């Protein structure tokens, strides 16, 4: 027959009777010392109220079963954290933690990129103020006219509205015909072309091989400045401190060895217009 995971839970909680308004005083005092007899009856009696609260958040990000189960997490926290010294009521205190738990769960389990609780609270203000303005009188929604109603700068409103991720799906058929997907047409920026990969490996080996066709002392100062022969980046004063042992003499051989590779590069068929343009 027809079976669903929604009505199977509602029929199980609908068999427990309602708690009398004069019987919860004996169960609340016993829960402080610790006993698994009054806590089971107190939570089971409040299961009929979490459904009416979860039904108010219709067409939201979370489903109906996720909203009912999230509200039940606050019921245990509300019972264990309470004080019966007031004696005014007890059902009005459980609905404060159940409603607070839905808001903290509907903003952390809705979007893909999780937003912190300090920036997501003020984001609902810009979205709520934008709804009333668009329906004033044949009005069109825009980010320019909303900056004056909230006294917000022009650069601040563009960042708050742009903070919404609103991620799309790549497994969607673009167009009327369902024959092509969005993921099959995307490219990558990190990986390169097989010809470009060999082009970078050839130039990297030609640069290191050209350094051997020079003086034995001019190749050591250039390998320590830029860090090409297995070295790191450094400055001119650091190389001329201990290895260089000079102030301006290291800077003199650096400008001569810089132009020495310029003439050997132009004669090799690789001019400035072909690489640097």
Partner 1 sequence: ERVVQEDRFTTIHIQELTCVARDTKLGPEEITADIPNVGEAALNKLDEAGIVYVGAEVQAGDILVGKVTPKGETQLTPEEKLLRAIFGEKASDVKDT
Partner 2 sequence: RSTGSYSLVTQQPLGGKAQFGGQRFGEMEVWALEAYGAAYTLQEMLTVKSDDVNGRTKMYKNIVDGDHRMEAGMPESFNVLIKEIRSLGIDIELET
Partner 3 sequence: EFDAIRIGLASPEMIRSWSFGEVKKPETINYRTFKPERDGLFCAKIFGPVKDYECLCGKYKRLKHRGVICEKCGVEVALAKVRRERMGHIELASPVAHIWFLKSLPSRIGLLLDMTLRDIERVLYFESYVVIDPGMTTLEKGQLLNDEQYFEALEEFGDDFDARMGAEAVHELLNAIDLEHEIGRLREEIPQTNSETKIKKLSKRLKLMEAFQGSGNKPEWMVLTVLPVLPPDLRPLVPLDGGRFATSDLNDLYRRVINRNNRLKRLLDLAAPDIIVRNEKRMLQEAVDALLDNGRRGRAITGSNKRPLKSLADMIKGKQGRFRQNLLGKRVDYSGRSVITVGPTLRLHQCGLPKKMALELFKPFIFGKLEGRGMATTIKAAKKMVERELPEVWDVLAEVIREHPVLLNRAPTLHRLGIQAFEPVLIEGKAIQLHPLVCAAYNADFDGDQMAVHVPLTLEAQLEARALMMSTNNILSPANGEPIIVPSQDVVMGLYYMTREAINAKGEGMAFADLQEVDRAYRSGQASLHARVKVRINEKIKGEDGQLTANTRIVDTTVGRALLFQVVPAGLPFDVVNQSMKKKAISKLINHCYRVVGLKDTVIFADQLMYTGFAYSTISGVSIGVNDFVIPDEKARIINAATDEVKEIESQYASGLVTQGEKYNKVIDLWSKANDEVSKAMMANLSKEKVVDREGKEVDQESFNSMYMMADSGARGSAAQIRQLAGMRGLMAKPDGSIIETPITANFREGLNVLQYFISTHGARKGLADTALKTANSGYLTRRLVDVAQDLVVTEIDCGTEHGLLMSPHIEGGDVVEPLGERVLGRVIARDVFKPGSDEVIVPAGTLIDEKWVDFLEVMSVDEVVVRSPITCETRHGICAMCYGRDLARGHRVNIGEAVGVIAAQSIGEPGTQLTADNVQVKNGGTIRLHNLKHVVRADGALVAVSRSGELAVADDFGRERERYKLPYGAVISVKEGDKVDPGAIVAKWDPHTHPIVTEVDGTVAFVGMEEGITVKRQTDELTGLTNIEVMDPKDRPAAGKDIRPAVKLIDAAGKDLLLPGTDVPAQYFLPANALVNLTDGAKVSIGDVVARIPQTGGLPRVADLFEARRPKEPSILAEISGTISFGKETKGKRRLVITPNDGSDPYEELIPKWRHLNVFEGEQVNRGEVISDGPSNPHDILRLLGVSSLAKYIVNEIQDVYRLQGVKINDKHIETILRQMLRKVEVSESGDSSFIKGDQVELTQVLEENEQLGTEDKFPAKYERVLLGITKASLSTESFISAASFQETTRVLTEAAVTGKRDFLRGLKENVVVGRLIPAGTGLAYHSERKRQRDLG
Positions touching partner 2 (CB under 8 A) are: 183-188, 191, 193-195, 197-198
222 touching partner 1, by CB under 8 A = yes
> 40, 89, 229, 247: which one contacts partner 3 (CB under 8 A)?
40
Size of the site for partner 3 (CB under 8 A): 55
Q: Using the rule CB under 8 A, is 153 a contact of partner 3?
A: no
- Among the residue ranges 31-39, 44-52, 91-99, 219-227, the one whose residues contact partner 1 (CB under 8 A): 219-227
Burial 137-171, CB ≥16 within 10 A → b, else e:
eeeeeeeeebbeeeebeeeebeebeeeeeeeeeee
Q: What are phi and psi of 122, to 5 degrees?
A: -75, -15
In the set 20, 144, 273, 274, which binds partner 1 (CB under 8 A)? Answer: 273
Determine if 262 is a binding residue for partner 1 (CB under 8 A). yes
The item of partner 1, partner 2, partner 3, none sharing an interface with residue 261, based on CB under 5 to 8 Å by kind, is: partner 1
Q: Which residue, 54, 49, 47, 52, is CA-closest to 68?
A: 54
Q: How many CB atoms lie within 10 A of CB 128?
A: 9
**18 or 195, CB closer to partner 3?**
195
Q: Which of 81, 82, 91, 84 is closest to 50 using CA atoms?
A: 91
Q: Is residue 162 a contact residue for partner 1 (CB under 8 A)?
A: yes
DSSP SS3 for 7: helix
275 interacts with partner 1 by CB under 8 A: yes
Examine residue 233 and tell whether it contacts partner 1 (CB under 8 A). yes
Q: CB of 208: closest distance to partner 2 in angstroms?
A: 18
Tell me which of 53, 120, 150, 228 binds partner 1, using CB under 8 A: 228
Residue count (the chain): 277
**Spatial separation of the C-alpha atoms in residues 207 and 228, rounded to whole Å:** 9
Residue 17 binding partner 3, by CB under 8 A: no
Radius of gyration of the chain (CA): 35
196 burial (CB, 10 Å; 0-12 / 13-18 / 19+) is: exposed
Residues of the shown chain interacting with partner 1 in the complex, contacts defined by CB under 8 A: 158, 162, 204, 207, 222, 226-228, 232-233, 258, 261-262, 265, 272-273, 275-277
């Amino acid at each position: 027959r027809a079976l669903d995971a929604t009505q199977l839970y509602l029929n199980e909680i609908g068999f427990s009777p309602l708690l009398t308004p004069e019987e919860e005083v004996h169960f609340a005092r016993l829960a402080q010392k610790g006993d698994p007899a009054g806590r089971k009856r107190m939570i089971e009696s409040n299961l009929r109220l979490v459904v009416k609260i979860a039904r108010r958040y219709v067409n939201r990000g979370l489903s109906l079963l996720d909203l009912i189960e999230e509200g039940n997490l606050g019921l245990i926290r509300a019972v264990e954290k309470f004080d019966p010294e007031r004696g005014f009521r007890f059902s009005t205190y459980a609905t404060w933690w159940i409603r607070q738990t839905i808001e903290r769960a509907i903003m952390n389990q809705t979007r893909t990129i999780r937003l912190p609780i300090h920036v997501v609270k003020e984001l609902n203000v810009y979205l709520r103020a934008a709804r009333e303005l668009t329906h004033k009188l044949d009005h069109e929604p825009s980010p320019e006219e909303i900056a004056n109603l909230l006294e917000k700068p022009v650069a601040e409103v563009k960042r708050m509205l742009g903070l919404n991720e609103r991620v799309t799906s790549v497994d969607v058929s673009l167009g009327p015909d369902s024959d092509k997907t969005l993921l099959d047409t995307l490219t990558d920026d990190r990986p390169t072309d097989p010809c470009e990969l060999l082009q970078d490996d050839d130039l990297s080996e030609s640069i290191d091989q050209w350094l051997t066709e020079l003086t034995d002392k001019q190749r050591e100062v250039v390998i320590r400045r830029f860090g090409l022969r297995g070295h790191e980046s450094s400055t001119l004063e650091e190389v001329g401190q201990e290895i260089g042992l000079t102030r301006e003499r290291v800077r003199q051989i650096q400008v001569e060895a810089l132009k020495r590779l310029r003439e050997i590069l132009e004669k090799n068929g690789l001019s400035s217009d072909a690489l640097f343009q």
